[PDB]
Amino acid sequence: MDARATIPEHIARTVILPQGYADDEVIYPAFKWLRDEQPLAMAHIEGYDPMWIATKHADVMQIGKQPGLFSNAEGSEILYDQNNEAFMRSISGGCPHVIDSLTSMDPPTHTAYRGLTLNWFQPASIRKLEENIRRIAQASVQRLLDFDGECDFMTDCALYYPLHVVMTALGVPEDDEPLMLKLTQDFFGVEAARRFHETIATFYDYFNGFTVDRRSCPKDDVMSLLANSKLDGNYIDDKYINAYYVAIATAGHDTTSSSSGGAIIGLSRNPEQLALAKSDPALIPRLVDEAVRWTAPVKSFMRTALADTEVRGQNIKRGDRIMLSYPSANRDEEVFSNPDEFDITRFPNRHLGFGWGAHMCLGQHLAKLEMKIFFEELLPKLKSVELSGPPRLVATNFVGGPKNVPIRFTKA
């Protein structure tokens, strides 16, 4: 079954299939076997293409730095079994990408489209939003504190906070939360082509009304920036502007909620850390990097090789699919000691949670700023937080992490 495939089928099924990601003691041991035994090897299971699994921190940095060699755009950047990639190419008119977002793009296209928002996402630009993001965090902290010491931290709090922040960055009204939750939770959640096609049409007509509006009535927000952008003396095609609004909102919602949940499971299991964080606010930034390392919400992205190459003495033929495991890179013993412990003091924390390379998460500065402001508002409000039952994690090999964290808390 592709004779170059060496990973034992049991490990291979555990790392690829979506089931095992709902449980950390299923998936982290398998990846640990891989890093210790077959750090970069080929797996081929039934229903999927052969693929190399880059499990080492150093190999994920190296593949991600070379877009000329390992392509986003040639195959599906998302891990789908053949069956599914097929249904998708139907929906998508031949090509393995459901919308034309930055992740489906190789440079120079990618550099141009990414270029349009890149500086709006840089730290200095993101500071303008601070009074707003603190207003949103206080409303969300209040909501949780209105419970008498019990709630699901996700579905009662962290589900809405990251969506409110990305709605404000885009310029979408507070009142359209229903439709944005429908976009990220229902339509892009975890005949069908007939209903796909007219549902994306309805969202595109909706966003289209904002593009037109920002073109006569400009505001400082991402919709206005991209509406009014022009590449070669012409406005960006509506397909790319609307895929960009969708890419930011979906890319920015679940990853930030999941990492905030991850932080609460880590502090609930390690009360010495809550106490440490409460006594030195300077440590919140440290807690945010550790929550995103430890949680690793994006479990993988894919790459297709554009030439025969060699990484860690392996000979990657042209056309080979490669899986990038951000969870395995964040627990590589060559970079981190006791990588399974949640430890907020961990420094330096050079995790690959936001990726590395050309496609490195555009929203990383916005994601660290809104998680830091949320926790600065929340931690002083709590005397304690503990889990009241097991977190429920999403079974998915793409964006998973906690979906339910039932907690008990005492107000300060």
Which positions lie near ligand HEM, rule CB under 6 A?
64, 102-103, 114, 166, 247-248, 251-252, 255-256, 259, 292, 297-298, 301, 326, 353-357, 359-363, 366-367
How far apart, in Å, are the Cα atoms of 99 and each of 32, 207, 238, 243, 260? 34, 15, 12, 6, 28
- What token pair was written down for 121? 């996402």
Q: How far is the CB of 113 from ligand HEM (least distance, A)?
A: 8
Can you say how many angstroms the Cα of residue 251 is from the centroid of all Cα atoms in its chain?
Answer: 6
Tell me how crowded residue 156 is: count the other CB atoms within 10 A of its CB.
18
- CA–CA dist 252, 242 (Å, integer): 15
- Compare residues 45 and 105 and give the one whose CB is closer to ligand HEM: 105
Is residue 42 helix, strand or coil?
Answer: strand
The verdict on whether residue 217 carries a ligand-binding annotation is no
Tell me whether residue 398 or residue 409 sits nearer to ligand HEM (CB atom): 398
Least distance CB 260 / ligand HEM (angstroms): 8
**Residue closer to ligand HEM, measured from CB, 20 or 252:** 252
CB of 400 vs ligand HEM, minimal distance in Å: 11
Minimum Å distance from CB 365 to ligand HEM?
9
Least distance to ligand HEM, CB of residue 411, Å: 27
Least distance (Å) from ligand HEM to the CB of residue 185?
16
The closest of 103, 81, 89, 95 to 196, measured between CA atoms, is: 89
Lay out the sheet containing 382-387: strands in order across.
Answer: 150-152, 406-411, 382-387
DSSP 339-356: TTS--TT--S----TT--
Centroid of chain to Cα 261: 14
CB 163 within 8 A of CB 253: yes
Distance, in Å, from the CA atom of 216 to the CA atom of 227, rounded to the nearest integer, reads 10
Peptide bond into 8 cis (omega under 30): no
Query: Whose Cβ is closer to ligand HEM: residue 267's or residue 367's?
Result: 367
Q: In 171-237, which ranges are continuous DSSP H helix? A: 177-181, 192-214, 222-228
Question: With respect to ligand HEM, which residue has the nearer C-beta, 44 or 300?
Answer: 300
Cβ closest to ligand HEM, residue 45 vs residue 398: 398
| Nearest to ligand HEM of 255, 273 (CB atom) | 255
- In the complex, least distance from residue 86 CB atom to ligand HEM, rounded to whole angstroms: 24
Cα–Cα separations (whole angstroms), residue 178 to 164, 183, 209: 11, 9, 17
Helix axes 161-170, 364-378, angle to 10 degrees: 130
DSSP string, 72-83: SSSS-SS---HH
Q: Shortest approach of ligand HEM to residue 233 CB, angstroms?
A: 24
In angstroms, what is the C-alpha Rg of the chain?
Answer: 21
Sequence-distant (≥ 6) Cβ neighbours of residue 369 within 8 angstroms: 123, 126, 127, 129, 130, 133
Nearer to ligand HEM by C-beta: 44 or 398? 398
Q: Which is nearer to ligand HEM, 45 or 73 (CB)?
A: 73
Q: How far is the CB of 326 from ligand HEM (least distance, A)?
A: 5
Task: Provide the token pair at 249.
Answer: 């909102």
Binding residue positions: 361
Binding residue positions for heme: 361
